[PDB]
């Protein structure tokens, strides 16, 4: 399958209550592997997956240094942006940044991204060419000019195409037992009487990884996506995911309904049928 | 591994 490494950064100002809150997290696919929290005791980048723990102090030092540079830039940005938008010093504001890279099943680069938001609204983003910038408004256009003069796009491109891919592959290798596994959903179907003429079939997929899945109901082979209740895919807390899909059927016509499950961990898609 | 050069990327 394809794989990705993604970093997420959030800075929240807290006027009169000290320095902004800053939280960073890194993922490989749907597995978190590092974090930093400005308010935690360590003031260090910290491991959140077993396989990253074998990296030595040089790495923990380097990541801590870089992550603090992220925080410091966002801290200055919160001041810059308040000024650009004529906002007072009293209110709390947010800066978010996300970047990372995808590789294909052959572990060659597919694409990179780098996006930035202020107060939850797009502000500036690198285009897919890893050369051009999308600016949301006139403030971000001034940022764009600054970033052009500093060759920011060239710096990020070399990172996304080079460093990001190298380290994603290294982590895939080191954490192969967990990251390159697929856990196929454990599936089952419950039946609940609504009344004496209808019942709810609910189709469950549990303990699966990665998070991507498709659950659909059919009736005599016809799709039913107007009459299916879905839940959003949700974390189980143990590294796996959950999802369900339900339909309200006439009682005694249960046999006409089939649940179809698509997941990377399945030889072949599943058809389930009540009983 | 995190990107370098964030000091050079102020808004």
């Amino acid at each position, epitope marked *: 399958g394809s794989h990705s490494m993604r970093y997420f950064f959030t800075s929240v100002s807290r006027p009169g209550r000290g320095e902004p809150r800053f939280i960073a997290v890194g993922y490989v696919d749907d597995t978190q592997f590092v974090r930093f929290d400005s308010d935690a005791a360590s003031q260090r980048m910290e491991p959140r997956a077993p396989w990253i723990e*074998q*990296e*030595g102090p*040089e*790495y923990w030092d*380097g990541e801590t*240094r870089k992550v603090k*540079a992220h925080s410091q830039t966002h801290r200055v940005d919160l001041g810059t942006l308040r000024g650009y938008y004529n906002q007072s010093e009293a209110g709390s504001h947010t800066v978010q940044r996300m970047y990372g890279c995808d590789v294909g099943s052959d572990w060659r680069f597919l694409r990179g991204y780098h996006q930035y938001a202020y107060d939850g609204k797009d502000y500036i983003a690198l285009k897919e060419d890893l050369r051009s910038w999308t600016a949301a408004d006139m403030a971000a256009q001034t940022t764009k000019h600054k970033w052009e003069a*500093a*060759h920011v796009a*060239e*710096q990020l491109r*070399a*990172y996304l*195409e*080079g*460093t990001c*891919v*190298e*380290w994603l*592959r*290294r982590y895939l*290798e080191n954490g192969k037992e967990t990251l390159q596994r697929t856990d196929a959903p454990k599936t089952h179907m419950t039946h609940h009487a609504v009344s004496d003429h209808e019942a709810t079939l609910r189709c469950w997929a549990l303990s699966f990884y990665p998070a991507e899945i498709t659950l659909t109901w059919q009736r005599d082979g016809e799709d039913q996506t107007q009459d299916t209740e879905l839940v959003e895919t949700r974390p189980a807390g143990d590294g796996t995911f959950q999802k369900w899909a339900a339909v309200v059927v006439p009682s005694g016509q249960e046999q006409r309904y089939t649940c179809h499950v698509q997941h990377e961990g399945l030889p072949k898609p599943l058809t389930l049928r009540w009983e | *591994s995190l*990107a*370098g*050069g964030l*000091d*050079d990327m102020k808004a």
Partner: T-cell receptor, first 112, second 112 residues
């Protein structure tokens, strides 16, 4: 840090040898350089663990092998007087960790 | 050249300030280093710097200016034991920050 064996070697023209570089620093990137008066450090070949080795500025006459993360071997198959130099191995954590730690150096003298 | 340093050799009386400068061509460079190499020994990393700033370590001051693309090294109260070749090194952006480009080096002699 980085160790190199041997420290010194005399070869007759035409003989072969392998220089070994080892490190215990968890480094993924390893490099082999030669240093001669008037030219400074010149990269022969380098290696990123998980990738094919890459030629440097002066690869001709040398081969390399990266059988494991810890070890980077430089091979001279047919020693020539031009290969009389001081060879330095170096290691770095990987991409974006560009600080290199250098081994103590290997002096090779090739004689008729 | 991508990394350029004071040609040298450089002679300084004991007690004086030794001034070393390095210019680099890539505005996207991120990692900058100063190495010291004693005669017959291997290069040793003595300073690293990553932001426009001044960084002090004892008698050594490194200063980076990313906007003007230079990095400098000052040695205050120069000592004879500082006599060595000093090398500027920059992580190469092109290729994915995977190696160092080194300047030609400045031979410093501190006269007792």
């Amino acid at each position: 840090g980085v160790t190199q064996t041997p420290k010194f070697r005399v070869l007759k023209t035409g003989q072969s040898m392998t220089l070994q570089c080892a490190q215990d620093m968890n480094h993924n990137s390893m490099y082999w350089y030669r240093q001669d008066p008037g030219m400074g450090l010149r990269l022969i070949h380098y290696s990123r663990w998980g990738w094919e080795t890459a030629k440097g500025e002066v690869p001709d006459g040398y081969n390399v092998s990266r059988l494991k993360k810890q070890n980077f071997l430089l091979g001279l198959e047919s020693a020539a007087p031009s290969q009389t130099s001081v060879y330095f191995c170096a290691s770095s954590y990987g991409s974006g960790y560009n600080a290199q730690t250098f081994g103590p150096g290997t002096r090779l003298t090739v004689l008729e | 050249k991508e990394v350029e340093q004071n040609s040298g050799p450089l002679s300084v009386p004991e007690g004086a300030i030794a001034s070393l400068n390095c210019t680099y061509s890539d505005r996207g460079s991120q990692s900058f280093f100063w190495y010291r190499q004693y005669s017959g020994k291997s290069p040793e990393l003595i300073m690293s710097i990553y932001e426009t700033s001044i960084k002090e370590d004892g008698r050594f001051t490194a200063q980076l200016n990313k906007a003007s693309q230079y990095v400098s090294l000052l040695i205050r109260d120069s000592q004879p034991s500082d006599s060595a070749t000093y090398l500027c090194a920059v992580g190469e952006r092109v290729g994915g920050y995977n190696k160092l480009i080194f300047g030609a080096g400045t031979r410093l002699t501190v006269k007792p």
